[PDB]
Amino acid sequence: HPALRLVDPQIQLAVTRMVGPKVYPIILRLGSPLSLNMARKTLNSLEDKAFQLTPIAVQMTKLATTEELPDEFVVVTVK
Amino acid sequence: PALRLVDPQIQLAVTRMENAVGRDQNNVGPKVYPIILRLGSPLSLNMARKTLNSLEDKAFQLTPIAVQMTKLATTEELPDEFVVVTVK
Ligand SMILES: CCCCCCCC
Numbered sequence: 001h002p003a004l005r006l007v008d009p010q011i012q013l014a015v016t017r018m019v020g021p022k023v024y025p026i027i028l029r030l031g032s033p034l035s036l037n038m039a040r041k042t043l044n045s046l047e048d049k050a051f052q053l054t055p056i057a058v059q060m061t062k063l064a065t066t067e068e069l070p071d072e073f074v075v076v077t078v079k
Numbered sequence: 080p081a082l083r084l085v086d087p088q089i090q091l092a093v094t095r096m097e098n099a100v101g102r103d104q105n106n107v108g109p110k111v112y113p114i115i116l117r118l119g120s121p122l123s124l125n126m127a128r129k130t131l132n133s134l135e136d137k138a139f140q141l142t143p144i145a146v147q148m149t150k151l152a153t154t155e156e157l158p159d160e161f162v163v164v165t166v167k
Pocket residue numbers: 007011026036058076085089114124164
């Protein structure tokens with residue numbers, strides 16, 4: 001019943017292990033939902049530094065027709 | 080759940096198409112960030128290329144990809160710029 005969902009092309013997957021860094025579109029077969037946080041060590045004190053997590057809102061159109069699928073991509077599956 | 084550290088073979092690519100003001104920020108390239116999983120429900124990853132190009136229905140060649148992820152225990156193991164993927 002989970003229909004394939006296409007992640008918009010500002011979020012892609014770089015796979016160096018198969019042939020150099022290659023960006024690949026992302027398909028999601030969501031079983032459980034999924035969030036996406038950007039982490040940087042920019043909460044600088046006088047001595048330490050902390051991590052701030054700014055969530056990234058990823059737009060996910062669900063796939064209408066399988067003809068829309070690209071020639072090549074990666075399928076991330078969440079159970 | 081526990082924090083796994085995906086090895087540099089697999090990283091997230093994020094492109095800033097514009098700026099905050101909408102300034103056309105093209106020809107600057109993507110930005111690759113190491114991935115870390117707040118992994119609850121387990122996760123899979125398959126490369127896919129189209130095959131069976133006899134027009135009938137388009138088919139895809141799903142070759143699984145080995146996700147080498149290492150459990151992290153210290154903060155200096157954590158880079159100063161990364162991405163956290165959270166699954167329930
Ligand atoms: C919304 C992007 C999901 C990327 C998951 C990558 C896990 C190796």
